[PDB]
C-alpha cells in the first residue's frame, strides 16, 4: 500500500515526527518537576513520575 | 585581520627593521636608546590605554 | 482631492522628486579628471582649516 | 509601415463547458475533476467542518469558566455563612503593606 | 624642531597642489608626482640621519626604487594614451563618462 | 596574455594582499599596496579598447596619489614617536592623512569619482578582482590602526558614502555602475562600525564579497551590460532569472534572506552605545539604496520584456561556460540567515 | 493572453546612458555593445 | 565649524539677542561658502565673473536663511518667554524655509523647505535640550 | 473527558514548563545586562583581558655592550 | 575584541577547546547545513541543464559531505569562542568586588511606584 | 508548535514530486488535514498562556488567528485556478510553493515569542507577496502597486527594529513574559515619545490609518485573488496582532501622546466610508471597506479597555472572513466578465440564481448583521469608545449608516435590475465557486453560535 | 545514434566520479573518527 503511492504518507508522518519531537523537548525541559509551590504532592504510587 | 604567520613560522623577517634598540649590524646604539628601552619595558604587557595613562 | 491628489503629492511625489533631483545633480558629471582632483584638493583644505579633523 | 508586434491575436475565451456537460468547476479532465469535488466535499466538510463543530462545541472549560462558577458558589456560601461581607475590599492585607511616610 | 623640516613639508604641500591642480597635460602631473617622491625621500632621510637610526636606513632607497617603478608604469600608460590619440591632453578623455 | 603570465599576475595580487595582512612594519604595508596596484593594472586592459586604457589611467592616478599620501602619514609618524610598528599612531594629523589615504584607496564619497568610471570600461573579471581584493586588503590596515582615529573622519566619510552611493545609483541603466555604487554604499556600512566593534566590519566584508561574487558570476554566465540583455537572459534560461531575483533581494537586505545579517547586527552593536539617530539615518538610506535593485529585478524576472528572435537559434546551444563557484556561493550568500551565531567565528 | 506584459515603449524608457534626461544630460550617448570604441 | 557652533550655543536661549543673529549669519556664510566651493569646483561656470556671481548668490541665500532663522528665534523667545519648547525653532525653520523659497522664487519648494527645516530645527533643539550624544559615546 | 485524556495536557505539565522557562530566560537576561556592564567598565578602565591592543614586544630589546658608552 | 593572551597563533582551535564537550552528531544546525548542501546540489544540477533530482548523486553526496565537515569545525570554533567569553566574564566578575555591589532586594511591601490610571 | 511548523515544510516537496494533474488534489487534501490538526490546538486555559517552547508560545489572541491562517490556506489554494490553469507546470508549482512558504512565515509570525523574531518574520511575510502580486497582477500598474507596498511597509516598519534593539539592551531579553512581569512605566520625556512614535507608527503604516492608506487599494485592485485575500485578511490582522502585543510596554505616555492618532483614525474612517460610496472598480470598494474597519480597530487598540480588546479581536476575525469572501465574489464576477468595473456587469438576479444568496449573505455579514461576529466586534468598540468620551458615538453611528449604505449599494448595483443584454458569455455557476463560498460563510455562522473562542486574552 | 558530433560529456567518465566518491567516503570516515576521538578525549578530561 505504501510503495503503490507514497505521496499521501508524507505530511501525516511529518506531523507524527513533530509531535514526537515536541514530547522530546518536553522531556528535555523537565526541571521543577515537584518544585512548584502549588502543584506539589508526594510522589505516588509506583515509579518516579507525575508528567512526561 | 592581523594574521600572525609571522609568529607561527618563527621567522624574524619584520622584527629588526621595526623598532630601535634591536641588534644593529655593528653592535652600536641609537641616539635615544635608553629612553625607548625604559618606555618599552614600561608598556610591555599593558593594554595600550592604561599604557597611555 | 484629499486621498489621491494631495496624499500622492505629499508622501510619494515630494520624496521621489527629491531623490530624482539629487540624483540628477550628483551623477551628471562629465569625465574630466581636473574637476575630480580639484574636488580632492578642496576636500583636503576644507577638512584641515575650516572644519578641523586633526583637533 | 510598422506593426511593432508579431504575437498571436489573443485570446480565445475558454468556455469550460461544451466538452464536458457533467463538468465540475475546473478543466476538462473527467476523472480528476470528480476526485477534486469528492475530496473538497468530503475532507473539507464531512471530516473537517462537522468534526470541528463537535470538537469546539464542547471541550474542557475554556478560560476556566464553569470552574469559576462552582468555586464562586462555594465561596459565596462560605462567606455568607460566616458573618463577614462577601468580597471584602483591599484584596492585599493592610498588615502586609508599608507606606512611605510623610 | 629642526627648521629645515618646516620648509621641506612646505615643499611637500607645494608639490601636492601641483599634482592635484593641473591643466591639459599628464607629463607635468607625473613629474610633479616625482617631485613629491623626492620630497618624501629627503624628509625621511634627514630624519634617519639625525636620529642615528641606522638599521632602518632602507626606507629612502626602497621608497625611491618602488616609486620610481610607479613612475615607469605611469609613463607606459601615458604612452598608451598618446598612442590611442594624437596628443596626451587631460582633454579628449571625456568619454567613459560618470 | 599567456596563462602562465595570468597565473603569475594573480599570484602577485595574492602576494600583495598577504604582505598587507601579515607584516608588523609600515614599509611592507606600503609595498603591499603598491605591488597590488602594479599587479592589478594588467588585469585591466585584457582587451585593447581605449576604454580600458583610460580607466587604468584614472585608477592609476587616484591609487598612486593615495599611496603617496599614505607614505606622507607614515613619515609624519616617524617624525613623532619613532618606530615602524603597526599600532596606535601619535598625531591626529598623521591619522588624518592616513585615513584619507585609505579612503581614497577603497572609496568614500568625496573620493569615489574613479569607481564607476573604472568599472565601466573593463570586463567583469577585472571588476570582480578589484572590488573583492581592493576592498578586502585595506580593511586589515584599518582594523590594525583603529585605536588611534579621530571619529569625525570615519563617521562623516561613512555617512556621506552611504548617502552618495545611494543617491547616485537611481539614474544608471548600466550594470557596472550600479554595482560600483553598491560597493560605495557597503564601504560606508563597513566603515561606520569600525570604532565600535570591528568583528562586524570583517563579517560584513565576508558577506559583501560573497554577494559580489554571486552577482558577477550570474553576469559571467551570460554576457550582459544592460538590463535589456538581462531580459533576453530571462528568455534564454529560467534559473538565471530566479537567481538574479534572489541575489538582488539579498543585496537589498530583507530579513528572511541572508543580506539582513550584515545590517541588523551592525544596528545591534551600534545601538548598544547611545547612538540612535545615526542608525536610523543609515538604515533609511539602506531603504533608499534598494530601489535600483528593485527596478533591476522588475527588468529581469518579474515582468517580461519582449525579446528579439535569434533566441530561436540560441536555444539549440546550451550555456556551456564553467562557473567559478556559482551554486555554493549562491546558497551560502542567500540561505545563511539562522547561522547568525557564526558571528563569533572571528575572534 | 489577457495578462498584461510590458510593451516596446515600456522598455524604451530603459535606454540611453542615464535614466532621467534633463536639460544638461542629453549628450550621454549609450555605450557601444562591443565595448570597442571606433578609431 | 565647532568654534562658531559653540558661539551659537554659548548664548542663553533665553535672550542675549543679535549675538544670536550674528552667529547665525556666520553659520550661513560658512555653509554657503562650502556649497559654493564644491559647485565651482565641479561645474566651472565659464567664466570667472559668473563664478563670483554664483558664489555670492549661494552665500547670500544661505546667510539670509541663517539671519532670518536667528531673528525669528530671538523674537519667538522674547514673545513666548519659554526657553524650553521647540515650537519656537519650528517657527524658525518654517521662516527660513519660506525665505529660501522667496530667494529661489518657487512657492512649493518654500513650503517643503518650511516643513523640513522646521522639523529639523525642532529636532536639533530637542537634541540639545534633552541631551542626545550624536556620533559617539565612543565607548561602550 | 476523552478529549482531555487523549490529546491535551495537564495544567501541571504546562505550569511547571512555564516556571522552568522563566528560570532559564531570567538567567539569560541577567547575564546579558551583566555582560554589557562588564564590557563598558572594561573599555573604560582597561584592566580586563578583552580590550588590550598589542603594544611593543620587549623580547627584541636586547641590552648589550654597545659602541658608544653614553647610550 | 582582541587578545586575550597574545601569544596567540592563527590557531583555528586550541587544545583548550577539547575540554568543553564537542557538538553532537545530528544537532539541528548541522542537519540544516546538510539540507543546505542538498539544496546546493539540487540547484547545481539546475544551473547547467542536466536533469534535477538525478545524474549527479556523487556530486550530491560530495556537497553534503563537504558542507557538514566544514560546518562541524565551525561549530566547534563557535563553542570555543562562547566558552572563553563566559570564562573571561566570570573571571572579571570575581576579580573586582567593588564596582558590582549586592543590590538591596526590596520587596513590594515597600517599593512605591506611580499609578496613572487609564480611565 | 513544531508539530505545525514541520508539516508545513513537508507539504512543500509534496507539490514538486507530485505528478502532473495530481499536485492539486494532494495539496488541497493535505492542507485541509493540516487545518483539522490546527483546530486541535485550542487548549488554552485560564491563568497562563501555553508555551510551545522558549521559542514558541500561544496567547489566546494568537489561537483564532492561527486557525484562521491554516484555514485560509486551502481555501486560497483552491481559489487560485482558472486564471493560471493554462500556465506552465513549473510556474504553477512555483506559485503554490510560494503560498506554502508564505503560510510558513505567517505561522512563524503568529507564534513569535520574541519581538525581534516577530519583526524578522513580519518582514518575511512581507517578502513573497510582492513576487506574487507582481508576477500575476494581470494589470499594467502592478509594478506601481508592489513598489508602493514595499517601500511604504519597509520605511514605516524599519525604525521599529532600532527601538526593539534598544529595549533588548536596556531591559534584558524580549520574551513576552519577561518583557512582562518586569515592565516599568516610562515617563513623559521626548526620547520615550519618539520610541513610542516609532513602534506605533510602524504598525500605523501596517494597518493602515488614513494618512497612509493609499498603500492598500492599488495592492488589491492590481493583484491576483490569492495575494489579495492573504494580504487583506492575514497581513492587516497580523499588524493588529503585533500592536496588541507591543502595547503592553509604554503605559503612561499613551494617554499624553495618543490623541492625534485616534483623531486621524476616526475622521479618516468617516472619509474612507464616504469615498467607497461613489467609486467604480468593484474590487476597490472592499479595499476601502477594509481601511474603514481597520481604522475602527485602531481606535479600539489605542483606547485600552478590556471590552475594547475583546471587540477588537472579534472585529479582526469577522472582517478578515468577510472581506476575503467578498474579494472572492468580486473575482468570480471578473472571471464572468473581463471588466473590473461596476456599472457594466448588471443584472445577475435572473441569471445565476444561486449567487444572489452568497452576495446577500456576504453583504449582510458586512452590514453588521446582529447575531454575526462583525456586529459583536463593532458593538463592543462602540461601548468602549462611549466610555472613552460621551460625544464620539456620533462618528461611530455615522460610520454605521454609511457602511450599511455603501455595502447595500454594492449589492443592488451589480446584482439588481436589468441585464445589459449584450453580454452573452456568462456560464452558470461552477461547483468550485460555491464550494469556496460555503467554506467562507459556514465557519462564520458557526462562530456566531459560539463566540467564546474568538474573544481574546481578556475573556 | 541520435547525435551528430557526439557530446563531449554525458557519456560517463570513470576517473572523476570514482575520485569524488573515494574522497567523500574518506572525508566521512575522517570526521567520524575525529568525532569519536573528541568524545573520548572529553570523557577522559572530564
Ligand atoms: C547640500 C546640497 C545643496 C545642493 C543640492 C542640489 C540642489 C539643486 C537641485 O536639486 O536642483 C534641482 C531642483 C531645483 O531646480 P528647479 O528647476 O528650479 O526646480 C523647479 C522644478 O519645477 C521643481 O519644483 P516645483 O516648483 O515644480 O515643485 C517642487 C516642490 C513640490 O511641492 C509640492 O508638491 C507642494 C507640497 C509639498 C509638501 C508640503 C507639506 C510637507 C509636510 O517641492 C519639492 O518637490 C520639494 C522636495 C524636497 C522636500 C520634500 C518634502 O531641485 C529641487 O526640485 C529640489 C529637490 C530636493 C533637493 C534636496 C533634497 C534633500 C534631501
Ligand atoms: C539641499 C539644500 C537645498 C535644497 C533646495 C534647493 O534645491 O536649493 C537650490 C538653491 C539654488 O536654487 P536653484 O535655482 O534651484 O539652483 C539650482 C542650481 O543651479 C543647481 O546647481 P548644480 O546642479 O549645477 O549643482 C552643482 C553642484 C552643487 O554642489 C553640490 O551638490 C555640493 C554639495 C555638498 C554637500 O553639484 C556638485 O558639485 C555635485 C558633485 C558631487 C557633490 C558631492 C561631493 C562630496 C560632498 C562633500 C561635502 C563636504 C564634506 C566635508 C568633509 C569631507 O541652492 C541653494 O539654496 C544653496 C544654498 C543652500 C543653503 C542650505 C539650505 C538647507 C536646507
Ligand atoms: C476562526 C478560524 C477558522 C476556524 C475554522 C473552523 C471553525 C469551526 C467552528 C465550529 C463552531 C461550533 C460551535 C457549536 O456548535 O457550539 C455548540 C452550540 C452552542 O453550545 P456551546 O458551545 O455554547 O456549549 C454547549 C456545551 N455542552 C455541549 C456541554 C452543552 O450548540 C448548539 O448550537 C446546539 C445545536
Ligand atoms: C523615528 C526614529 C526612532 C528612533 C528610535 C527611538 C528613539 O529612541 O529615539 C530617540 C533618539 C534619541 O534618544 P535616545 O534613544 O538616545 O535616548 C536617550 C535616553 N536617555 C536620555 C535616558 C539616556 O532620537 C532620535 O532617534 C531622533 C529622531
Ligand atoms: C511615513 C511613511 C513614509 C513612507 C515613504 C515611502 C517612500 C515614498 C514612496 C516610494 C515609491 C515611489 C515610487 O515608486 O515612485 C515612482 C518612481 C518611478 O516612476 P516613474 O516616474 O515612472 O519612473 C520611470 C520608470 N520607468 O520612483 C522613483 O522615482 C523612486 C525614487 C526613489 C524612492 C526611494 C524610496 C524613498 C527613500 C527616501 C530616502 C530619504
Ligand atoms: C499656501 C499657498 O496658497 O501658497 C500658494 C502656492 C501657490 O502655488 P503656485 O501658484 O503653483 O506657485 O501654493 C503652493 O505652492 C501649495 C503648497 C502646498 C500646500 C499644502 C497644504 C496642505 C495639503 C495637504 C492637507 C492634508 C494633509
From Swiss-Prot, chain C:
Transmembrane segments annotated in the record for this chain: 31-51
Subcellular location, record wording: Mitochondrion inner membrane
Stated family: Belongs to the complex I subunit 5 family.
UniProt subunit comment: Core subunit of respiratory chain NADH dehydrogenase (Complex I) which is composed of 45 different subunits.
Role according to the record: Core subunit of the mitochondrial membrane respiratory chain NADH dehydrogenase (Complex I) which catalyzes electron transfer from NADH through the respiratory chain, using ubiquinone as an electron acceptor. Essential for the catalytic activity and assembly of complex I.
Name by which UniProt lists this protein: NADH-ubiquinone oxidoreductase chain 5
Residues of the full protein shown: 552 to 606 of 606
Swiss-Prot record, chain E:
Family matches, as Gene3D superfamilies: 1.10.287.3510
Lipid bilayer topology: Multi-pass membrane protein
EC number: 7.1.1.2
Keyword Ligase (UniProt): no
Record's keyword annotation contains Membrane: yes
Main location (coarse class): mitochondrion
UniProt family annotation: Belongs to the complex I subunit 4L family.
Name recorded for this polypeptide: NADH-ubiquinone oxidoreductase chain 4L
From Swiss-Prot, chain F:
Keyword NAD: yes
Organism superkingdom: Eukaryota
Any GO CC annotation of this UniProt entry: mitochondrial inner membrane
UniProt keywords, alphabetically: Electron transport, Membrane, Mitochondrion, Mitochondrion inner membrane, NAD, Respiratory chain, Translocase, Transmembrane, Transmembrane helix, Transport, Ubiquinone
Chain segments annotated as coiled-coil in the UniProt record: none
Catalytic activity, reaction form: a ubiquinone + NADH + 5 H(+)(in) = a ubiquinol + NAD(+) + 4 H(+)(out)
Any one Pfam family match given in the protein's UniProt record, by short name: NADH_dehy_S2_C
Keyword RNA-binding carried by entry: no
Recorded GO MF terms: NADH dehydrogenase (ubiquinone) activity
InterPro entries in the record: Complex_I_Subunit_2 (IPR050175), NADH_DH_su2_C (IPR010933), NADH_UbQ_OxRdtase_chain2 (IPR003917), ND/Mrp_TM (IPR001750)
E.C. no: 7.1.1.2
Transmembrane segments: 3-23, 25-45, 67-87, 96-116, 122-142, 145-165, 178-198, 200-220, 237-257, 274-294, 325-345
Membrane topology reported for the UniProt record: Multi-pass membrane protein
Subcellular location: Mitochondrion inner membrane
GO term, biological process aspect, one: mitochondrial electron transport, NADH to ubiquinone
PANTHER family named among the record's database cross-references: NADH-UBIQUINONE OXIDOREDUCTASE CHAIN 2 (PTHR46552:SF1)
Job description of the protein: Core subunit of the mitochondrial membrane respiratory chain NADH dehydrogenase (Complex I) which catalyzes electron transfer from NADH through the respiratory chain, using ubiquinone as an electron acceptor. Essential for the catalytic activity and assembly of complex I.
Family: Belongs to the complex I subunit 2 family.
Subunit structure: Core subunit of respiratory chain NADH dehydrogenase (Complex I) which is composed of 45 different subunits. Interacts with TMEM242.
Name under which the protein is recorded: NADH-ubiquinone oxidoreductase chain 2
UniProtKB/Swiss-Prot annotation, chain K:
An annotated Gene Ontology molecular function: ubiquinone binding
This protein's name: NADH-ubiquinone oxidoreductase chain 4
Disulfide bonds: none
Top-level taxon of the source organism: Eukaryota
Membrane topology: Multi-pass membrane protein
Main location: mitochondrion
Entry's transmembrane regions: 22-42, 60-80, 98-118, 147-167, 196-216, 224-244, 256-276, 284-303, 308-330, 351-371, 391-411
Subcellular location: Mitochondrion inner membrane
Subunit structure comment from the entry: Core subunit of respiratory chain NADH dehydrogenase (Complex I) which is composed of 45 different subunits.
Pfam families: Oxidored_q5_N, Proton_antipo_M
Annotated function: Core subunit of the mitochondrial membrane respiratory chain NADH dehydrogenase (Complex I) which catalyzes electron transfer from NADH through the respiratory chain, using ubiquinone as an electron acceptor. Essential for the catalytic activity and assembly of complex I.
Family listed: Belongs to the complex I subunit 4 family.
Gene Ontology biological-process annotations: electron transport coupled proton transport; mitochondrial electron transport, NADH to ubiquinone; mitochondrial respiratory chain complex I assembly
Keyword annotations: Electron transport, Membrane, Mitochondrion, Mitochondrion inner membrane, NAD, Respiratory chain, Translocase, Transmembrane, Transmembrane helix, Transport, Ubiquinone
GO cellular component: mitochondrial inner membrane; respiratory chain complex I
Enzyme Commission code(s) on record: 7.1.1.2
InterPro entries given in the database record: NADH4_N, NADH_Q_OxRdtase_chainM/4, NADH_UbQ_OxRdtase, ND/Mrp_TM
Catalysed reaction, written as an equation: a ubiquinone + NADH + 5 H(+)(in) = a ubiquinol + NAD(+) + 4 H(+)(out)
